[PDB]
Amino acid sequence: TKFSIYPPIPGEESSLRWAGKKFEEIPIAHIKASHNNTQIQVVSASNEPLAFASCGTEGFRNAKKGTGIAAQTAGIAAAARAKQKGVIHIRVVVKGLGPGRLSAMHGLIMGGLEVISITDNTPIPHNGCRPRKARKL
């Protein structure tokens, strides 16, 4: 067949398998790319925490956490703890427009993990709560 960019809906039967596992079963890599930090947490299909890493947990301080090298370092630290539990294929769910939004995705690949999808779950309200006032800096 051809190749579609839309994810295979669970209900309808498909033929796309990864290591004999359906798309639903693949573990999920929740990335929260903030402006001053980047936390990464890998979970299974049944929401079971397997690995957690962040720039702070890798020995970075203050303004070094909001860089692209600290997010990549955090991906290698989470892709090395989850590869010992039998994780190879993951579903990336990026949340945030921070510096370590794409650099953490590269770090997960530098740990032996293969990314099959890229999901964006950045919080966008349909007017809800009021942000802080604009600054003059």
């Binding site: 890798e58 020995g59 970075f60």
Partner: protein, 191 residues
């Protein structure tokens, strides 16, 4: 300013005096050999004492890294020891108007009440000839407003070949205060 958090897998110094999680002294070992123990037992290294010339690092579990600082959050709360003194500066002019001298004299009263150090400097007024007789009479005029609260730390000096005078003020020390108090009572009550 430091925190009891893991340093990570990047060590600056090649030789470290590693310490066991249980407090056993592993002994000095190569930097590469330190990371092997962080994976073999999945433990994080924290620098216990920077001051010592030989690098000292202790590897403990994440829960052990939380309990440590969780006690440093109480020791400082129970017995806080913050003694740094901020230093303030003022640059006046001999011909400074009284109104501006009363506003700047009230600013010094807030600094002396917060146990700050006030560096006061006086300069020759614009196109004004004056000696150090009336140029040094402003310190005595400022200190008089604070009789007991403030006292000289340093004394007027010719910082810049005599054109300018610099002095430092401080909040009166507890002991000194008591002495001032004691003296005040005798003058009026005994009479």
């Amino acid at each position: 300013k430091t925190a009891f958090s893991n340093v990570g897998r990047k060590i600056s110094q090649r030789v470290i005096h590693l310490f066991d999680e249980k407090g056993n002294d592993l002994g000095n070992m190569h930097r590469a050999n330190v990371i092997r123990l962080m994976d073999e037992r999945d433990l994080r290294l924290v620098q216990r004492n920077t001051s010592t010339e030989p690098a000292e690092y202790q590897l403990m579990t994440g829960l052990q890294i939380l309990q440590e600082r969780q006690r440093l959050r109480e020791m400082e709360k129970a017995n806080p020891k913050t003694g740094p003194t901020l230093r303030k500066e003022l640059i006046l002019s001999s011909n400074i108007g009284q109104h501006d001298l009363d506003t700047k004299t009230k600013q010094i009263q807030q600094w002396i009440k917060k146990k700050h150090l006030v560096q006061i400097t006086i300069k020759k007024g614009k196109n004004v000839d004056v000696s150090e007789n009336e140029m040094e009479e402003i310190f005595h005029q400022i200190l008089q407003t604070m009789p007991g609260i403030a006292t000289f730390s340093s004394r007027p000096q010719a910082v810049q070949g005599g054109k300018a005078l610099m002095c430092v003020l401080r909040a009166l020390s507890k002991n000194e205060e008591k002495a001032y108090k004691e003296t005040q009572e005798t003058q009026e009550r005994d009479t």
